[PDB]
């Protein structure tokens, strides 16, 4: 039993809700919130900009030190950093950005990072400003993640579309 509330159950382990991931994380304080990151951990817009704003830029400060030490992530890769005031940990995961010409096949590799954590609050990877089809992202999530994932969907029209179209 966990403190996630109001989610629709899609499968044994995947749950979905229309919610602002920032407001969700503040309420639940999950062990892990997933950020829709880029390889430079530059949290400018989308989920990343919103999460970083909610940390008063502490996420960006921590991320800049991470990059200075370790260099960029790989597309499809991840790193675990602090969750600041939002969660215990933030799993920064880089899905492919179609608006940069990146290989959508790497979306499965991106979701594989979730399997290293028993429970996560997450957005749909590569959706929104990353330019992939969200129906596809949900399908890859369901077919790749085996741990318990609570998906927050920002856009109500898309939330309704993902449920009604879910197979």
Binding footprint of ligand A1A9R on the chain (CB under 6 A): 20-22, 36, 46-47, 50, 123-124, 127-128, 152, 154-155, 158
Whole-angstrom Cα distance, residue 106 to residue 100? 13
Binding partner selected for residue 87 from ligand A1A9R, Cl ion, none, CB under the kind-specific 5 to 8 Å limit: none
* Span near Cl ion by CB under 5 A; candidates 67-75, 93-101, 105-113, 127-135: 127-135
Question: Taking CB within 5 to 8 Å according to partner kind, which of ligand A1A9R, Cl ion, none is near residue 123?
Answer: ligand A1A9R
129 binds Cl ion (CB under 5 A): yes
Residue number with CB closer to Cl ion (85 or 99): 99
In sequence order, which residues have a C-beta less than 8 Å from that of residue 34 and are 6 or more positions away? 90, 91, 92, 93, 114, 120, 121, 122, 123, 125
**98 contributes a contact to Cl ion by CB under 5 A:** no
State the minimum distance, in angstroms, from the CB of residue 154 to Cl ion.
7
Q: Which residue has the tokens 């989610």?
A: 7
Q: Single out the residue of 114, 66, 119 nearest to residue 88, CA to CA.
A: 119
Nearer to Cl ion, 118 or 155 (CB): 155
What single-letter DSSP state applies at residue 111?
H
Question: How many whole angstroms separate alpha carbon 73 and alpha carbon 94?
Answer: 8
- Stretch (H or E) spanning 78: strand 78-82
**Residues near Cl ion (CB under 5 A):** 46, 128-129
């Amino acid at each position: 039993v966990n403190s996630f509330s109001g989610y629709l159950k899609l499968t044994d382990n995947v749950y979905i809700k229309n919610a602002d991931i920032v407001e969700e994380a503040k309420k639940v304080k999950p062990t892990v919130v997933v950020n829709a990151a880029n390889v430079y951990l530059k949290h400018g817009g989308g989920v990343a900009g919103a999460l970083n704003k909610a940390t008063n830029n502490a996420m960006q400060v921590e991320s800049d030190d991470y990059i200075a030490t370790n260099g960029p992530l790989k597309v499809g890769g991840s790193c675990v950093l602090s969750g600041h005031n939002l969660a215990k940990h933030c799993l920064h995961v880089v899905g492919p950005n179609v608006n940069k010409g990146e290989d959508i096949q790497l979306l499965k590799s991106a979701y594989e990072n979730f399997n290293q954590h028993e429970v996560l609050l997450a957005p749909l990877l590569s959706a929104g400003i990353f330019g992939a089809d969200p129906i596809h992202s949900l399908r890859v999530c369901v077919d790749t993640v085996r741990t318990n994932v609570y998906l927050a969907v920002f856009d109500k029209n898309l939330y309704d579309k993902l449920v009604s179209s879910f197979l």
